[PDB]
Write an enzyme that holds these catalytic residues in place. Structure first.
Site, mmCIF file in Angstrom:
data_model
loop_
_atom_site.group_PDB
_atom_site.id
_atom_site.type_symbol
_atom_site.label_atom_id
_atom_site.label_comp_id
_atom_site.label_asym_id
_atom_site.label_seq_id
_atom_site.Cartn_x
_atom_site.Cartn_y
_atom_site.Cartn_z
ATOM 1 N N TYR A 127 8.408 19.797 7.730
ATOM 2 C CA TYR A 127 7.171 20.178 8.391
ATOM 3 C C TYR A 127 6.939 21.682 8.283
ATOM 4 O O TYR A 127 7.869 22.474 8.119
ATOM 5 C CB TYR A 127 7.195 19.747 9.860
ATOM 6 C CG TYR A 127 8.219 20.462 10.713
ATOM 7 C CD1 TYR A 127 9.534 20.009 10.785
ATOM 8 C CD2 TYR A 127 7.863 21.565 11.483
ATOM 9 C CE1 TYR A 127 10.468 20.657 11.569
ATOM 10 C CE2 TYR A 127 8.787 22.215 12.261
ATOM 11 C CZ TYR A 127 10.087 21.758 12.304
ATOM 12 O OH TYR A 127 11.005 22.411 13.093
ATOM 13 N N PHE A 183 -0.801 21.094 10.512
ATOM 14 C CA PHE A 183 0.559 20.818 10.063
ATOM 15 C C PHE A 183 0.570 20.429 8.595
ATOM 16 O O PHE A 183 -0.047 19.432 8.211
ATOM 17 C CB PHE A 183 1.198 19.708 10.892
ATOM 18 C CG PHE A 183 1.449 20.089 12.306
ATOM 19 C CD1 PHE A 183 2.546 20.861 12.641
ATOM 20 C CD2 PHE A 183 0.589 19.678 13.305
ATOM 21 C CE1 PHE A 183 2.781 21.218 13.950
ATOM 22 C CE2 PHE A 183 0.818 20.026 14.616
ATOM 23 C CZ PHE A 183 1.912 20.800 14.940
ATOM 24 N N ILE A 215 5.552 15.463 19.392
ATOM 25 C CA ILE A 215 4.249 15.356 20.037
ATOM 26 C C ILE A 215 3.467 14.183 19.460
ATOM 27 O O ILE A 215 3.833 13.626 18.419
ATOM 28 C CB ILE A 215 3.460 16.666 19.896
ATOM 29 C CG1 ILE A 215 3.333 17.027 18.420
ATOM 30 C CG2 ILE A 215 4.131 17.777 20.673
ATOM 31 C CD1 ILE A 215 2.430 18.189 18.149
ATOM 32 N N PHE A 241 3.598 29.328 12.961
ATOM 33 C CA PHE A 241 4.433 29.356 14.148
ATOM 34 C C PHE A 241 5.723 28.569 14.003
ATOM 35 O O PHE A 241 6.601 28.731 14.853
ATOM 36 C CB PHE A 241 3.656 28.863 15.381
ATOM 37 C CG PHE A 241 3.194 27.440 15.295
ATOM 38 C CD1 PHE A 241 1.980 27.129 14.710
ATOM 39 C CD2 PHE A 241 3.952 26.415 15.844
ATOM 40 C CE1 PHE A 241 1.546 25.824 14.640
ATOM 41 C CE2 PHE A 241 3.524 25.112 15.776
ATOM 42 C CZ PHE A 241 2.321 24.814 15.173
ATOM 43 N N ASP A 242 5.879 27.739 12.975
ATOM 44 C CA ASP A 242 7.132 27.026 12.765
ATOM 45 C C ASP A 242 7.209 26.594 11.310
ATOM 46 O O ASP A 242 6.184 26.374 10.661
ATOM 47 C CB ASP A 242 7.251 25.806 13.687
ATOM 48 C CG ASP A 242 8.676 25.307 13.813
ATOM 49 O OD1 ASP A 242 9.574 25.877 13.158
ATOM 50 O OD2 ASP A 242 8.905 24.358 14.591
ATOM 51 N N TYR A 255 -0.918 20.204 23.109
ATOM 52 C CA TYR A 255 -0.597 21.208 24.119
ATOM 53 C C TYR A 255 -1.794 21.786 24.868
ATOM 54 O O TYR A 255 -1.587 22.703 25.672
ATOM 55 C CB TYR A 255 0.179 22.382 23.489
ATOM 56 C CG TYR A 255 1.569 22.041 23.001
ATOM 57 C CD1 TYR A 255 2.624 21.898 23.892
ATOM 58 C CD2 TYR A 255 1.825 21.872 21.648
ATOM 59 C CE1 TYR A 255 3.895 21.588 23.448
ATOM 60 C CE2 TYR A 255 3.092 21.564 21.193
ATOM 61 C CZ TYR A 255 4.121 21.423 22.096
ATOM 62 O OH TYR A 255 5.383 21.116 21.646
#
Length: 107
Positions: free
Chosen positions: A26, A99, A56, A36-37, A82
């Site tokens: 991912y 994503f 999630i 962010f990731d 979120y």
């Protein structure tokens, strides 16, 4: 809401089922913002299972509409990830999630 935009190649038949553990490279991205990731940094490709609400909702539903080898591009609405609370200091409240998702799974 989940809006799949697939980079083509794979087989189009190997779908994830219940009780299966899948392997995802991912890559997070914020809309009109930076990353962010990413699992490409750690090279620990995030072995998780299906149907236990660990990930999630917007990421869990997108894995069901993919096959082995495919490469999607999620678009998670704020209501499923979120958008009311917001993750502390990392994900702001009422934010749209993007994503880049690869699925090279097992089982």
């Amino acid at each position: 809401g989940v809006e799949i935009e697939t980079i083509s190649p794979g087989d189009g038949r190997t779908f994830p089922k219940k009780g299966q553990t899948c392997v995802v490279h991912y890559t997070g991205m914020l809309q009109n913002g930076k990353k962010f990731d990413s699992s490409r940094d750690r090279n620990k490709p995030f072995k998780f299972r299906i149907g236990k609400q660990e990930v999630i909702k917007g990421f869990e539903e997108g894995a069901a509409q993919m096959s082995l080898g495919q490469r999607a591009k999620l678009t998670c609405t704020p209501d499923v990830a979120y958008g009311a609370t917001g993750h502390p200091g990392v994900i702001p409240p009422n934010a749209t999630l993007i994503f880049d998702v690869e699925l090279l799974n097992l089982e």
